[model samples]
Target: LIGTYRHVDRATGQVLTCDKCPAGTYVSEHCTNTSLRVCSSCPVGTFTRHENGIEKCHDCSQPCPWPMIEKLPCAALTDRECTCPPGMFQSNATCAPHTVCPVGWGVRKKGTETEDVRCKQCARGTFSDVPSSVMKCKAYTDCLSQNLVVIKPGTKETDNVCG
Candidate 1:
């Protein structure tokens, strides 16, 4: 028994602190006050996270639907933990394709579990060499400071080419 209840002892003639029941169990017929609590195991497919004298175990959350991944299950402990599989973000009822940054743009916000990735145009001085690459837009090469003679100006897809 993991829980307690008040029971008047007939022999001792005083209220006795008797065990009630533990987790995943319910109280059965009450025996003598000195005897331990008679507990019955809870039904199947139910869970009891904490020790208690509950009348019945609690029902578990619904099963993880298709395309949804399970990190941890409520295996008689607690609620289930789930999320979308890799390469995708969570959507209304399932996972969705992650956003891909196109040419001339960079990643403003990376993809999150609940939010999609966001993109931003390469700024006046920034450049993204490749389309759909994980690399973010970076500042153009500094030609003036290096004094290498600005041979070819940098574009959104190409960095400055020097002599």
Candidate 2:
């Protein structure tokens, strides 16, 4: 049997005819079948960033390097893996960090995106209220909604209550 003609590695700048990196291995350098091949397992705290023929090493998205985040091929034009820091969530190839809720609102633990955080108000009649950075407002009062009446005068206690 005759083998197909192979192009020289020097002829092409890219490694188009190279095998993909094996599982748990990365291509620090790319080489075509005709060229001397070089593939090595990526060390911790670094990533290949591409399928093969990576020009340089890439840093992980997360700051802490111990728990290595699994890497995938770059989908964007940069040809780098998408990454996120700890406590941040990734969706549709985008990363977002968690945040606390503002005052005068309550929190709902839906475990959803930050934009989906629920913020509700305390009802009328209830006066003072406080909220947590990550929680929504708690209900406070039970005041009448429609009609309000005064039972006492200034400097005097009132016997009149809501009718």
Candidate 3:
């Protein structure tokens, strides 16, 4: 029972409201004043395929996870992005752990907050003489303020000595 038809509910002939399409499904042909809308599930990889229906099909984005690859295909929302692990720094798609600074050399306090750490040489006469071994420069000219002498570079690990 479809096509131009008469109704008892109203005086003027009115068209029927389209039936709502079910989730994961879309309507093919709209309902007439006398019939219901026809619905069907979208084919894989080919969503709604058209705009006539209220339902839209979704496309898969990535491969499925391990252990159930064949049974359950991967979709955009169900995949996980790669990321670096804790204690390791990530750069250029790789991860590297922090490096220990050598004696007599101090690492720049800034930027070394994470892994793949980098270090810098301490100013002359500076030595890493404490726990944690962060290098600290020695005071020049032990007791002469105005006549202070600066230590030159190329010094090794030893008690603060003037070069």
Candidate 4:
């Protein structure tokens, strides 16, 4: 009855029909007329969560970088997902925090989850000594207050220089 087409297990040395590898494993060698199937564990960085007749395991996804946080971690059955945190924006390469727009600068555009804040220099005749997103530049200091003379008028980049 050898013609019945049965095969002997290589590891157990027992006669049996073909069987598929279980989850977390892959078939290293297929069953043959004389040899049984051979299976092996999925390598590191790879996984097979569901029972499959495949020869290879799926690879895990890369981890998220700084500024960007991981929403979900990679698992045997699923890939990882990432998102930018609050007060930050997402860029093609990485996540970045919103700009503060220093004392001499002004916010030209508000920051968003997908974009950084845009800023511009204060215009001529105006000056800002404190950082703010909505506050506009103030008029140059009045020299008459201190009984001083304006040596150099204020400019977009600097405050009034008095004598």
For all predicted structures, in order, the TM-scores are 0.63, 0.34, 0.30, 0.36
Shift in Å, residue 17, candidate 2: 1.7
lDDT of 2 by residue, 47-81 (tens): 55345444344555543232224345432222344
Task: For candidate 4, write residues 13-93 as lDDT tens digits.
Answer: 766665677777777876765766777887767777766656798887777776677775665444566778777888877
Q: Rank the candidates by TM-score, best first.
A: 1, 4, 2, 3
Give lDDT: candidate 1, residue 42. Answer: 59
**Count of backbone clashes, every candidate in sequence:** 0, 9, 0, 0
Give the higher-lDDT candidate: 3 or 4.
4
lDDT score, candidate 2, position 33: 50
Candidate 1 TM-score to native: 0.63
Alpha-carbon lDDT, every model: 0.72, 0.42, 0.46, 0.72
lDDT of 1: 0.72
lDDT of 1 at 162: 68
Give the distance in Å from residue 13's predicted Cα in candidate 1 to where it truly belongs: 14
Model 3: lDDT of residue 69: 26
On a 0 to 1 TM-score scale, where does candidate 4 land against the true structure? 0.36
Off by over 4 Å in 3: 1-86, 109-115, 130-163
lDDT of 3 by residue, 1-163 (tens): 2222222324334645665655445566556666677777755543432333453456644543322123333232222233344444555545565555676555555223234545666566455543232334333334234454436333434443333
